[PDB]
Amino acid sequence: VDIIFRSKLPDIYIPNHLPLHSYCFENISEFSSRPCLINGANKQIYTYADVELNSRKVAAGLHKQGIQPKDTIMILLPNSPEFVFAFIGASYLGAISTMANPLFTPAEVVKQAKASSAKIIVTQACHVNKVKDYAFENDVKIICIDSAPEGCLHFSVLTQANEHDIPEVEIQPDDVVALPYSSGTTGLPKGVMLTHKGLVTSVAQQVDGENPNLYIHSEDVMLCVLPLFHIYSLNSVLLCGLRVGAAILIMQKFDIVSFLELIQRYKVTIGPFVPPIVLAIAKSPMVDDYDLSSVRTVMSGAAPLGKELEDTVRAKFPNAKLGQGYGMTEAGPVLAMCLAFAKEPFEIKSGACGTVVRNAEMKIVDPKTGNSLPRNQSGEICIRGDQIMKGYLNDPEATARTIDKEGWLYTGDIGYIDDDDELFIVDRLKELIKYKGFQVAPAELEALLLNHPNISDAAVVPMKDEQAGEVPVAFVVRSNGSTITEDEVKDFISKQVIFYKRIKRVFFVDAIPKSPSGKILRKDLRAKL
Ligand SMILES: COC1=CC(/C=C/C(=O)OP(=O)(O)OC[C@H]2O[C@@H](n3cnc4c(N)ncnc43)[C@H](O)[C@@H]2O)=CCC1=O
């Protein structure tokens, strides 16, 4: 029998039959006039009423541009009001948003645009060159938020539209609404189909209930420095923030001065961070010149924090509950959330990544045997519930390998649950690398390396790094007669990928350590490092 773990919080009613917009704005009449988005770039503020209305106008605009239910748009933007209006606008149409880093190479963007079948790309003028040729050849519309080059439209063509021109649509709970890309537990980035039902469930698991797991309310100011094109910010900052009527303070990029100035000046109360931000707070000499006493909740996720740094950063935020959460794109994303964040808080231990969310089930499985494990025994973390993905777009094989027929998602993370129902992550079984919380899929990098005519074999694995948590390093087997150097390998990769995917070290070997069956012994390579 599977040994099943659940939250210390009771299950709640979740209205996951509601479309995401209908759910997120369900209580909007209670905070219509309250600030919703604050753009750190220009200090422009949109109220809840403004955001709902602009989203509805954009929906009508998108429909006029040809977006039908189940069509997809690509958002290729930094954190911005336009990101939000495009995402929620598509939701109103029963359509799908795929989201991508605007700093991706042209090849990276176009690959995602093709895989997702994006009909419209929403971007900035400076990035039009990345997609222009592709878009022209395939009649994909380009909409720019600042200025529109030839063959492009301005975003105002969407906001000029009449909100009463949203077509009648029957959106189903299992309809897809968000399509972030993720490599999962092996291989290349794949399209994660997140549904109305799934996202409503995940948001509710965090912020709903008499005692919510993550207590946020309409007088909070939540910093949105994490990128909305990644699932952490999209779900736990934007969608959760909207649900409870909180103000969301948008930053386009991390800048330590801007970060501190904004926290102090806007009296930020919720700080959704990642470990490298926590590291910057612990290291920077200017932090002591700032008043950060407004912050009541500091969250870290996406990568391990580690007891030491966690304990330390409580000093810089004297009034804050500090804790970790644990997410994975395929999981909706939140698997576990710190119960110190609850309206009626629980005791926690440093180094834990939370307690499994309510209205969900977790098990811990020995990778060697397939047997479920009891408390205080490490194995592969698995979760099930209505919050998880529908599956991978056009990839039933990858879906079948990732979620079993009993509904269990296998995370590829190794951890244990203690006597207090706190989850601790101790290792990663899957090949995924995390650079500052960003996904780096070794399979992508290995594919590039293998296609170099002077490389015979390659393996990319994480190396521990203070600043980034992990950096990608490559083990390379040179082809016969090859003289390719570490720098030449690095440059070859550097010219083809976004900065965070860059190989930081190259180690040249006679053979890649492989199992008898020829699978890369990634754990062995990690051990060598
Ligand atoms: C504050 O808590 C929250 C966290 C997240 C994390 C999302 C994420 O990272 O997804 P993805 O890019 O697919 O990568 C998923 C993989 O990242 C690792 N990871 C994640 N959180 C941790 C952690 N606290 N400790 C150690 N490792 C971790 C782990 O390997 C996981 O499978 C979302 C929302 C949220 O509220």
Which method was it determined by? X-ray
Are 136 and 151 spatial neighbours (Cβ–Cβ below 8 Å)?
yes
Q: Is 526 exposed, middle or buried (0-12, 13-18, 19+ CB in 10 A)?
A: middle
Q: Is 116 exposed, middle or buried (0-12, 13-18, 19+ CB in 10 A)?
A: buried
Are 522 and 459 spatial neighbours (Cβ–Cβ below 8 Å)?
yes
Task: Beginning with the edge strand found earlier in the chain, give each strand of the sheet holding 361-365 in spatial order.
Answer: 361-365, 379-384, 409-417, 423-428
Q: Identify the residue whose tokens are 């109305």.
A: 196
- Is 398 touching ligand 1 by the criterion CB < 6 Å? no
Are 188 and 443 spatial neighbours (Cβ–Cβ below 8 Å)?
yes
Nearest CA to ligand 1 atom 11: 328
The secondary structure element, H or E, covering residue 491 is helix 486-494
3-state secondary structure 196-216: HHHHHHHHHHHHCCCCCCCCC
Strands (E), 391-432: 391-392, 409-417, 423-428
456 three-class SS: strand
Number of Cβ atoms within 10 Å of the Cβ of 227: 25
The first and second tokens of residue 257, run together, are 């001065």
Query: Using CA of residue 38, residue 179, residue 235, residue 50, what is the dihedral sign?
Result: positive
Cα–Cα separations (whole angstroms), residue 505 to 62, 491, 497, 526: 45, 11, 16, 13
Are 356 and 335 spatial neighbours (Cβ–Cβ below 8 Å)?
yes
How far does residue 302's CA lie from ligand 1's centre (Å)?
A: 3
In this structure, what are the phi and psi dihedrals at residue 510, rounded to the nearest 5 degrees? Answer: -70, -35
CA 116 to chain CA centroid, Å, is 17
Query: In terms of Cα–Cα distance, which of 474, 471, 470 is closest to 486?
Result: 474
- Is 428 touching ligand 1 by the criterion CB < 6 Å? yes
- Is 183 touching ligand 1 by the criterion CB < 6 Å? no
Q: Which of 192, 202, 326 to mutate to test the pocket of ligand 1 (most atoms within 8 A of CB)?
A: 326
Q: Which atom of ligand 1 is nearest to the CA of 272?
A: 1
Resolution (Å) of this entry: 1.7
Give the span between the Cα atoms of 177 and 171, in whole angstroms.
Answer: 10
List binding-site positions: 182-186, 190, 232, 236, 253, 302, 324-325, 329, 337, 413, 428, 430, 434, 436-437, 439, 519
Are 310 and 334 spatial neighbours (Cβ–Cβ below 8 Å)?
no
Give the span between the Cα atoms of 73 and 97, in whole angstroms.
Answer: 5
Give the span between the Cα atoms of 85 and 54, in whole angstroms.
Answer: 6
Give the span between the Cα atoms of 222 and 211, in whole angstroms.
Answer: 20
Give the span between the Cα atoms of 12 and 163, in whole angstroms.
Answer: 34
Give the relative orientation of helices 256-266 and 275-283 as an angle to the nearest 10 degrees: 90
The first and second tokens of residue 192, run together, are 């994660």
Question: DSSP string covering 60-98, please?
Answer: HHHHHTT--TT-EEEE--SS-HHHHHHHHHHHHTT-EEE
How far does residue 63's CA lie from ligand 1's centre (Å)?
A: 35
Domains delineated in the chain = 1-429 (3.40.50.12780), 430-529 (3.30.300.30)
- Is 440 touching ligand 1 by the criterion CB < 6 Å? no
Q: Which atom of ligand 1 is nearest to the CA of 326?
A: 21
Q: Identify the residue whose tokens are 């500091």.
A: 298
The secondary structure element, H or E, covering residue 25 is none
Give the span between the Cα atoms of 377 and 231, in whole angstroms.
Answer: 29
